[PDB]
TrEMBL record, chain A:
Protein name in UniProt: Protein-L-isoaspartate O-methyltransferase
Database matches in InterPro entries: PCMT, SAM-dependent_MTases_sf
Recorded coiled-coil stretches: none
Domain of life (superkingdom): Bacteria
Organism, as annotated: Paracoccus denitrificans (strain Pd 1222)
Any one GO molecular-function label of the UniProt entry: protein-L-isoaspartate (D-aspartate) O-methyltransferase activity
GO cellular component, one term: cytoplasm
Automatic annotation (TrEMBL), chain B:
Occurrences of domain Zinc finger CHCC-type (ranges): 12-49
Keyword annotations of the record: Calcium, Metal-binding, Zinc
Organism encoding this protein: Paracoccus denitrificans (strain Pd 1222)
Residues the record lists as binding Zn(2+): 16, 26, 42, 45
Binding site for Ca(2+): 46
Protein name as catalogued: Zinc finger CHCC-type domain-containing protein
InterPro entries xref list: Znf_CHCC
Automatic annotation (TrEMBL), chain D:
Gene name for this UniProt entry: nuoC
Gene Ontology MF annotations: NADH dehydrogenase (quinone) (non-electrogenic) activity; NADH dehydrogenase (ubiquinone) activity; quinone binding
Alphabetized InterPro entries for the sequence: NADH_DH_suC, NADH_quin_OxRdtase_su_C/D-like, NADH_UbQ_OxRdtase_30kDa_su, NADH_UbQ_OxRdtase_CS
Protein name from the UniProt record: NADH-quinone oxidoreductase subunit C
Organism in which the protein naturally occurs: Paracoccus denitrificans (strain Pd 1222)
E.C. number: 7.1.1.-
Keywords associated with the record: Cell inner membrane, Cell membrane, Membrane, NAD, Oxidoreductase, Quinone, Translocase, Transport, Ubiquinone
From TrEMBL, chain F:
UniProt keyword terms in alphabetical order: Ubiquinone
InterPro entries named among the record's database cross-references: NDUFA12 (IPR007763)
Name of protein: NADH:ubiquinone oxidoreductase 17.2 kD subunit
Gene Ontology biological-process annotations: response to oxidative stress
Keyword flag rRNA-binding: no
UniProt cross-references to PANTHER family, sorted A to Z: NADH DEHYDROGENASE [UBIQUINONE] 1 ALPHA SUBCOMPLEX SUBUNIT 12, NADH-UBIQUINONE OXIDOREDUCTASE SUBUNIT B17.2
Superkingdom classification of source: Bacteria
Biased segments, Basic and acidic residues type: 112-124
Organism: Paracoccus denitrificans (strain Pd 1222)
Region (Disordered): 79-124
Entry GO CC: respiratory chain complex I
């Protein structure tokens, strides 16, 4: 299959027209092979404008969502980025081409091991895959300049937002029923202040649900 | 509520269609005046028909 | 079929062309753009104003018509057809009626058949007047639309006098046409037909042999027979290339067999040929309108609806006879049931083949109603058609394809 | 044309035995039910075969049948201007099953398959540009499935706070009314 | 050559100029609105109205056929037995921002209670002025009855 | 300032060029009770009205509406319309005024009708 | 007086030179076009089309507004210099119309932009739209100031 043509078409028609202007992001998405970062059974649909299912309750986000998500994080050459829920590592590979280094946190040992193999096979060396619970992050290498959460959340735990540098940026997809809002957060005076960025949908990550009990 | 229209009739069965030419009224219905009360009302236009008992002719 | 890397007759390769193309000249052509019909977002990649990539983004007028149709009866869905290729609404109603009539096995009265031909050709002129004269406006001619839309105004009055609406008639019904035409309306249609060729001459005098008009259309958007088969072309999009295909002749419907008209075809298959074909079709439609009015006058008085179990009775009968009142009550609430089955009914709509794929399941509502718009297939080919041309040619190419987005998006 | 369509159906059933599951001629139209694995080969044969020269792809659509093990039907409508005939091809597709793309045969199949993918959620393999074509960017769901609500789930509004057009959950001032008129009497089929 | 000669002498432009001047001095069909109006046939579908009988009683009997046929679900009706036992509505709303002005309701009405009238100049400054209630619709019928009745007579032979 | 109003405005009963045109080609057909004057040319081929006051198209009553819109051939002077005793006088569009129609629950009403569909128990 | 007569002059100039953006969404745009054609000649009122929002005073929302289109309509409205007026033309723009219960349609363009006049109809006739434009002129005369 000519995956290069499909990759170029994905950027032209799903990323560029969706208010993604950062050329570093466009350059990265034009170069990182998406099909190398999906399960083998999904290889032919790697460039479809939809979320790819990786494991039960986990997806590789749609190209529009990731393109816009990275464009608003506004990553710098000197940035250290935390990528929560890296799946097979596609997003980490894209961000690795912009930021200084990426700490990719994955919770499924099957996907964490595949991420290491696939990241190495693409000669990506500024990405460390750290295995553990998504809601914990990786506080060993904190603070981070930017945090990207690659799946829907209902709340972002304080433990996760404490690993954010002052002036750091966090982008998360929030789920309110059938509505999904991507919000961009800025750490100021120790508090992360969230603002609306755009609307997109993804399944809820395990460990980011909210406490919901009996209400009269 | 008072009736919008009263007609006095000498028959115990009347037809009402809204009195409008060539399909401009309501569906044509036949109404029976009870011998007890001596009047009936159209269910479409509310016109009241009242029997003239002295001249009321049985058919 | 990819010109993004420039190819020069001297074989030169620029240093920048060697680099991967990351910073391209991309421009939003529409939706708010005089040539974009309001709801076309075409993303163009330009290289010195040469169009190297055209990426139409549609759906800016997608309204979910096909979903909305599944919760309505067959009669309640008839007005949805008006609002697809809304320049000529009764022509789209016709496909819906034909599909229902085929599944129910219903025969419509003779007068209703003649009226359908009459107002279908009015719609063809309504469309071709809009297409040709706004196409002229796309290449800078200010005046043609003003002349053409005065004639459209008169035809929209003929619409209103038949059904009470200038645009969205809801006039063709499963089983015929809703109402009969007043005799004075037939006199006025005949009077209009006698004048109309004069306007066609005036538009022809202004445009056809104008050197500027020729330099904006001749050898622009050339379509070969093989291209037509790649992209599902129908209507003038194939006839301009010389294929004498017209559904009114190849797959006759209504009473078109007994009318006299000819099929204009082009020899070069470019924007100029398709303009000439549309002008000629307008003359042919005017002749059909004249024959239909003569046949209607020569007809004996008859009904315009099949009545029976498919259409409501007349109002006078409804107010007198018990059977008629029941049929009125039931057919305006539940409506007729359509036997289980699937049909595809197509007409030669003014913009090409318009069809309805109707899946009935024996109830009073469609199970699935797929609407086949000719403009959907025509617009899809704009990337192939526009590649290699200049930006100034784009509005002419959008015109020649005859796009209305009520039917592209549905 | 009825005898002609039955004769044509035998020709197809004979030459493409393994592709064709069955044929039907109803309401003057020939429908061919085909296997998913052989649909591309069959449509290619229909396009190129002398007797059946179906070189115009009229459209591709889908039909949802939630009561069926393979809930979707994908329907191909083809026209022959040279033979002056039409044909319909139907394949049954399960949810999450991939359908081979027809763009190799008909370049104009590209947008129709995007529409099926958008409105039904059926993915096509071998598609160069498979993305939503009619719904809003980032739309959730596939509206033409019978289990998607008519009004959907979300609606847009301009927010003065965000200075953006944002999505919100649907709130209807008047709820959709779905009248049920259908009579409990089928009627008779007289002989 | 003949075509090349005519282009050198600008004949195509001269013909256009002459045609333009013929239109220049010709009568204009423009209407002098609001003094002069376009033509309306008796069938014209305009603003809705609820009619009364010649005896002054309401024609509507709350059958709800108009509410059932309405393709846009623009009609909402509630009915009870009136104090005299008559079958009459207590609510009759038309959402004029949902209505498609198709005229199906007046076709479905068995008593000519709801009609689309000749009026089309009722643009409003606020949206809620287009949520017509029963009294608004009846007021339209009482003001436009004379023209509505004449139009019904004119189109009766075709209905 | 009467002449200036005629010279500078177009919403006061007629422009100056409408008046000249009416004088040249107008033939009076009748008057309505508001003082609007109706004219025709070519024996009713063209029909127009000169407004007494603001030129508001919704001021034309149903008495003349049919003639002015060519629905009926003959003017109400020659063929008056039959009126029922329960009919009400014509009103123009009242949208920008205090007489505009508003729904019963509108906040314009200043006594919006309170709605409910159940009766609540009241403690003794 | 000075200020009221100043506003009257401003309202006179703004009413007599009301330029509208070339912006039509659906079948309401067909009747809007007829309003500018010879039978009605909207331009004779000084109400002329302008391709660019930077030169437009009036937006006529003529057609269905879908969710996908709503941001684009808001953007070009935001790029109109002030004063800017909006006319909602037809059922779809007024309240959603025939597609009110759809998943992809804005149920009234006043959810996106403020509206000055609503013109009823599906479509309003070319004359009905012309009436609506003159009602906007009455509104400006009644309430127009230097701000709008
Ligand atoms: C040095 C020369 C170069 C040109 C000068 C510079 C340009 C100046 C700018 C102004 C341009 C004015 C354009 C005027 C066009 C008017 C219309 C036209 O050409 O005649 C067409 C019209 C006819 O239609 P109608 O009014 O419907 O007629 C019905 C009626 N029964 C009737 O016969 O009427 O018939 C009429 O309109 C008849 C009246 C004509 C009005 C005559 C005055 C025009 C102004 C000339 C200014 C000279 C300087
Ligand atoms: C008698 C006619 C004058 C002949 C003098 C020679 C002129 C040569 C001009 C030429 O050939 O180039 C045309 C040029 C070039 O056109 P072209 O693209 O055809 O190139 C000319 C090529 N030949 C001559 C070989 C066919 O025309 C233009 O640039 C467009 C003209 C602009 C619009 C003119 C409007 C005039 C209308 C008024 C006429 C009637 C008034 C009463
Ligand atoms: C002061 C100018 C006086 C002009 C009026 C003359 C009376 C004409 C009466 C008549 O029958 O005119 C017909 C036509 C109608 O015009 P109108 O009133 O717009 O249409 C209403 C239709 N119900 O009337 C017209 O078409 C009249 C159009 C008037 C145009 C006047 C132009 C004035 C000057 C323009 C610029 C001149 C430039 C300087 C040139 C210098 C060198 C010569
Ligand atoms: C040749 C040179 C021309 C110079 C430019 C002319 C344009 C400038 C003047 C504007 C036109 C007059 C105007 O603005 O009219 C307003 C007013 C209308 O008054 P009226 O309609 O009674 O009030 C409506 C209240 N909503 O106006 C009037 O009633 C007219 C009063 C005279 C005003 C003259 C300007 C001072
Ligand atoms: C009648 C209203 C007058 C209003 C003010 C007029 C302003 C005139 C501008 C200055 C004079 C320009 C003269 C242009 C040369 C005339 C061209 C011509 O008549 O072509 C023949 C042209 C032939 O066109 P054809 O009918 O398409 O062959 O004549 C006509 O059709 C009649 C037009 C005569 C115009 C003379 C009056 C000026 C207006
Ligand atoms: S005109 Fe049509 S959409 Fe409007 S209320 Fe009547 S039936 Fe409903
Ligand atoms: S207006 Fe007519 S159709 Fe509607 S409820 Fe009243 S009587 Fe029935
Ligand atoms: S209101 Fe009616 S005419 Fe206007 S855009 Fe909507 S469907 Fe078309
Ligand atoms: Ca009573
Ligand atoms: Ca290039
Ligand atoms: Zn009665």
């Amino acid at each position: 299959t000519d995956f290069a043509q499909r990759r170029t078409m994905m950027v032209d028609t799903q990323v560029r027209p969706n208010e993604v202007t950062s050329y570093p992001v466009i350059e990265a998405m034009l170069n990182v092979p998406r099909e190398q970062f999906v399960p083998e059974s999904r290889r032919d649909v790697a460039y479809v404008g939809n979320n790819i299912d990786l494991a039960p309750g986990r997806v590789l986000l749609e190209p529009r969502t990731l393109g816009k998500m990275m464009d608003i994080l506004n990553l710098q050459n000197g940035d250290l980025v935390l990528d929560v829920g890296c799946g097979y590592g596609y997003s980490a590979a894209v961000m690795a081409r912009i930021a200084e280094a990426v700490v990719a946190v994955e919770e499924d040992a099957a996907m964490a091991a595949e991420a290491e193999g696939r990241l190495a096979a693409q000669d990506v060396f500024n990405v460390a895959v750290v295995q553990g619970a998504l809601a914990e992050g990786c506080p060993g290498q904190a603070p981070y300049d930017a945090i990207l959460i690659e799946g829907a959340v209902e709340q972002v735990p304080e433990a996760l937002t404490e690993q954010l540098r002052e002036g750091g940026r966090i982008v998360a997809l929030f789920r309110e029923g059938n509505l999904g809002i991507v919000r961009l957060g800025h750490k100021l005076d120790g508090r992360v202040n969230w603002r609306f960025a755009f609307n997109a949908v993804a399944p809820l990550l395990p460990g980011f649900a909210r406490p919901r009990g009996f209400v009269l | 509520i008072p009736a919008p229209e009263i007609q006095t009739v000498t028959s115990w069965k009347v037809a009402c269609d809204g009195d409008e030419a060539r399909g401009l009224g309501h569906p044509r219905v036949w109404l029976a005046i009870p011998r007890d009360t001596g009047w009936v009302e159209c269910g479409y236009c509310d016109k009241r028909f009242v029997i003239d008992r002295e001249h009321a002719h049985d058919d | 079929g990819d010109i993004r890397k420039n190819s020069y007759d001297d074989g030169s390769m620029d240093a920048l062309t060697g680099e991967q193309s990351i910073r391209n000249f991309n421009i939003n052509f529409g939706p708010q753009h005089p040539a974009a019909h309001g709801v076309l977002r075409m993303v163009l990649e330009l290289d010195g104003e040469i169009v190297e990539r055209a990426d139409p983004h549609i759906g800016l007028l997608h309204r979910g018509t096909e979903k909305l149709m599944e919760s309505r009866t067959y009669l309640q869905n008839l007005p949805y057809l008006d609002r697809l290729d809304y320049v000529a609404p009764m022509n789209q109603e016709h496909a819906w009626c034909l599909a229902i009539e085929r599944l129910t096995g219903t025969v419509i009265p003779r007068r209703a058949s003649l009226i359908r031909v009459l107002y279908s050709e009015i719609g063809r002129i309504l469309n071709h007047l809009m297409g040709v004269t706004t196409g002229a406006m796309d290449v800078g001619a200010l005046t043609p639309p003003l002349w053409g839309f005065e004639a459209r105004e008169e035809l929209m009055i003929f619409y209103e006098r038949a059904c009470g609406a200038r645009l969205h008639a809801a006039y063709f019904r499963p089983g015929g046409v809703h109402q009969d035409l007043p005799p004075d309306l037939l006199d006025d249609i005949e009077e209009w037909c006698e004048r109309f060729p004069k306007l066609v001459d005036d538009l022809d005098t202004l445009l056809t042999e104008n050197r500027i008009f020729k330099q904006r259309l001749v050898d622009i958007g050339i379509v070969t027979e093989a291209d037509a088969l790649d992209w599902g072309y129908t209507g003038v999009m194939v006839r301009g290339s010389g294929l004498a295909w017209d559904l009114r002749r190849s797959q006759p419907y209504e009473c078109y067999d007994e009318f006299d008209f000819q099929i204009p075809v082009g020899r070069n298959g470019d924007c100029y040929d398709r303009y000439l074909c549309r002008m000629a079709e307008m003359r042919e439609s005017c002749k059909i309108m004249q024959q239909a009015v003569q046949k209607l006058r020569a007809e004996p008085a008859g009904d315009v609806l099949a009545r029976g179990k498919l259409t409501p009775p007349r109002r006078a009968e409804m107010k007198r006879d018990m059977e008629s009142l029941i049929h009125h009550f039931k057919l305006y609430t539940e409506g007729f049931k359509v036997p289980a089955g699937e049909v595809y009914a197509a007409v030669e709509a003014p913009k090409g083949e318009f069809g309805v794929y109707l899946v009935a399941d024996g109830t009073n509502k469609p199970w699935r109603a797929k609407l086949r718009a000719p403009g959907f297939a025509h617009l899809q080919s704009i990337d192939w058609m526009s590649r290699g041309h200049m930006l100034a040619d784009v509005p002419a190419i959008i015109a020649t394809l005859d796009i209305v987005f009520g039917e592209v998006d549905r | 044309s009825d005898e002609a369509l039955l004769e044509l159906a035998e020709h197809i059933a004979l030459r493409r035995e393994n592709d064709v599951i069955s044929t039907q001629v109803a309401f003057g139209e020939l429908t061919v039910n085909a296997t998913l694995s052989g649909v591309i080969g069959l449509i290619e044969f229909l396009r190129n075969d002398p007797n059946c020269r179906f070189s115009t792809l009229i459209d591709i659509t889908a039909v949802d049948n939630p009561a069926r093990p393979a809930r979707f039907d994908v329907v191909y409508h083809l026209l022959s201007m040279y033979q002056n005939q039409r044909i319909r091809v139907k394949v049954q597709v399960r949810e999450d099953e991939l359908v081979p793309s027809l763009i190799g045969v008909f370049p104009g199949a590209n947008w129709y398959e995007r529409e099926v993918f958008d409105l039904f959620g059926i993915l096509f393999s071998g598609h160069s540009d498979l993305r939503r074509i009619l719904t809003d960017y980032g739309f959730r769901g596939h509206p033409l499935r019978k289990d998607f609500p008519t009004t959907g789930y979300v609606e847009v509004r301009w927010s003065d706070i965000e200075k953006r057009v944002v999505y919100e959950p649907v709130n209807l001032v008047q709820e959709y009314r779905q009248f049920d008129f259908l009579s409990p009497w089928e009627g008779a089929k007289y002989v | 050559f003949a075509r090349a000669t005519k282009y050198f002498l600008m004949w195509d432009f001269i013909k256009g100029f002459g045609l333009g001047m013929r239109y220049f001095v010709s009568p204009k069909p423009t209407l002098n609105y609001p003094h002069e109006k376009g033509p309306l046939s008796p069938r014209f579908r305009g603003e809705h109205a609820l009619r009364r009988y010649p005896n002054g009683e309401e024609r509507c009997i709350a059958c709800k056929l108009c509410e059932a046929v309405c393709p846009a679900q623009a009609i909402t009706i509630d009915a009870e037995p009136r104090e005299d036992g008559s079958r009459r509505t207590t609510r009759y709303d038309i959402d004029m921002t949902k209505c498609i002005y198709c005229g199906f309701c007046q076709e479905a009405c068995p008593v000519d209670a709801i009609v689309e009238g000749p009026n089309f100049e009722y643009a409003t400054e606020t949206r809620e002025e287009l949520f017509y209630d029963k009294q608004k619709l009846l007021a339209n019928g009482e003001r436009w009855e004379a023209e509505i009745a004449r139009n019904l007579q004119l189109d009766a032979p075709y209905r | 300032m009467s002449f200036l109003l005629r010279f500078l405005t177009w919403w006061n009963s007629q422009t100056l060029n409408t008046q000249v045109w009416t004088k040249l080609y107008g033939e009076k057909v009748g008057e309505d009770d508001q003082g609007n004057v109706y004219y025709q040319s070519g024996g009713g081929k063209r029909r127009w009205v000169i407004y007494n006051g603001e030129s508001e198209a919704s001021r034309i009553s149903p008495e003349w509406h049919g003639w002015l819109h060519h629905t009926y051939k003959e003017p109400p002077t020659a063929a008056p319309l039959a009126h029922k005793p329960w009919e009400k006088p014509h009103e123009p569009n009242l949208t920008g005024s205090s007489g505009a129609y508003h729904p019963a629950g509108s906040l314009y009403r200043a006594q919006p009708v309170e709605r409910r569909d159940y009766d609540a128990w009241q403690p003794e | 007086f000075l200020l009221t007569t100043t506003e009257d002059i401003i309202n006179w100039a703004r009413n007599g030179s009301l330029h509208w953006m070339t912006f039509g969404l659906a079948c309401c745009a067909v009747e809007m076009m007829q309003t500018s054609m010879p039978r009605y000649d909207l331009e004779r009122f000084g109400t002329a089309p302008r391709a660019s929002p930077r030169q437009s005073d009036l937006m006529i929302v003529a057609g269905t507004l879908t969710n996908k289109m709503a941001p684009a309509l808001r953007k070009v409205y935001d790029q109109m210099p002030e004063p800017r007026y909006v006319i909602s033309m037809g059922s779809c723009a007024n309240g959603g119309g025939y597609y009110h219960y759809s998943y992809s349609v804005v149920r009234g363009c006043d959810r996106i932009v403020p509206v000055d006049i609503y013109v009823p109809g599906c479509p309003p006739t070319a004359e009905a739209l012309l009436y609506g434009i003159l009602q906007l002129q009455r509104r400006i005369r009644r309430t127009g100031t230097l701000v709008r």
